Amino acid sequence: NFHLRPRDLISNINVIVLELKGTFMCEYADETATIVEFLNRWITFSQSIISTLTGGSSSTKKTQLQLEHLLLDLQMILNGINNYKNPKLTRMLTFKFYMPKKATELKHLQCLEEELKPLEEVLNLAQGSGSELCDDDPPEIPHATFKAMAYKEGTMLNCECKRGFRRIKSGSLYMLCTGNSSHSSWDNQCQCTSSHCREPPPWENEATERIYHFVVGQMVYYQCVQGYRALHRGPAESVCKMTHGKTRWTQPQLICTG
Numbered sequence: 001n002f003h004l005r006p007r008d009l010i011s012n013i014n015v016i017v018l019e020l021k022g023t024f025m026c027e028y029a030d031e032t033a034t035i036v037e038f039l040n041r042w043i044t045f046s047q048s049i050i051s052t053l054t055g056g057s058s059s060t061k062k063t064q065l066q067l068e069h070l071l072l073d074l075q076m077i078l079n080g081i082n083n084y085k086n087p088k089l090t091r092m093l094t095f096k097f098y099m100p101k102k103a104t105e106l107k108h109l110q111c112l113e114e115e116l117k118p119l120e121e122v123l124n125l126a127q128g129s130g131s132e133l134c135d136d137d138p139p140e141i142p143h144a145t146f147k148a149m150a151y152k153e154g155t156m157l158n159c160e161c162k163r164g165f166r167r168i169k170s171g172s173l174y175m176l177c178t179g180n181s182s183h184s185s186w187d188n189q190c191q192c193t194s195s196h197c198r199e200p201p202p203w204e205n206e207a208t209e210r211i212y213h214f215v216v217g218q219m220v221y222y223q224c225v226q227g228y229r230a231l232h233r234g235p236a237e238s239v240c241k242m243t244h245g246k247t248r249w250t251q252p253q254l255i256c257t258g
Contacts, residue, residue, distance in 0.1 A: 153179020158211035159190035
């Protein structure tokens with residue numbers, strides 16, 4: 001229950017950041033951070049600079065209130081990510097945000113200005129609705145993987161990259177399957193620089209796999225990896241069902257041995 005449209009709040013925050021920086025190229029660090037660590041640095045960045053109110057000059061008093069309103073809009077978002085958003089938050093901590101290597105001057109707000117688009121992206125997660133998302137990742141199986149065949153309207157794919165590669169500065173953090181009623185296709189696009197839907201085509205992808213987040217009613221298909229063998233038992237697939245509020249995964253019965 002976010003008492004404001006994600007697009008409007010970021011709109012306000014965006015202009016505030018601009019009215020403070022006046023165009024220094026941001027310098028990041030190598031360590032990515034969760035959306036919470038991300039907000040902590042800038043909330044701390046806010047309060048710190050406001051305290052550096054060296055002399056009550058009305059020129060800087062302007063800068064002071066400019067920060068407070070920014071600060072408030074930051075603390076508000078963060079306060080509304082840790083409460084009851086835990087169903088989604090647990091997977092919202094999977095997204096990769098980027099931190100400033102240094103943050104003591106107003107020219108460092110460029111670092112924050114860029115990450116505003118992937119921020120609003122995550123802000124819609126609990127607001128852009130309308131199917132529902134599954135609280136957990138599908139149950140991992142010893143020496144076995146899984147793969148959904150038909151993506152449903154709303155499934156997402158993290159824009160993770162290869163080693164040494166980051167997702168594009170000020171770029172979206174994931175893709176989304178738009179179902180509507182007529183057609184059915186994907187929306188966003190991933191990008192990596194250096195230091196009824198179907199499966200999307202690769203980029204300079206992640207040299208691991210693909211971090212997914214499924215909607216309810218989506219089924220993943222399990223099977224053993226090579227060198228191992230299943231004997232079926234029960235079902236070899238899991239479906240995300242929302243039973244009595246909470247969402248869960250129908251436990252598949254499938255085991256492989258060497």
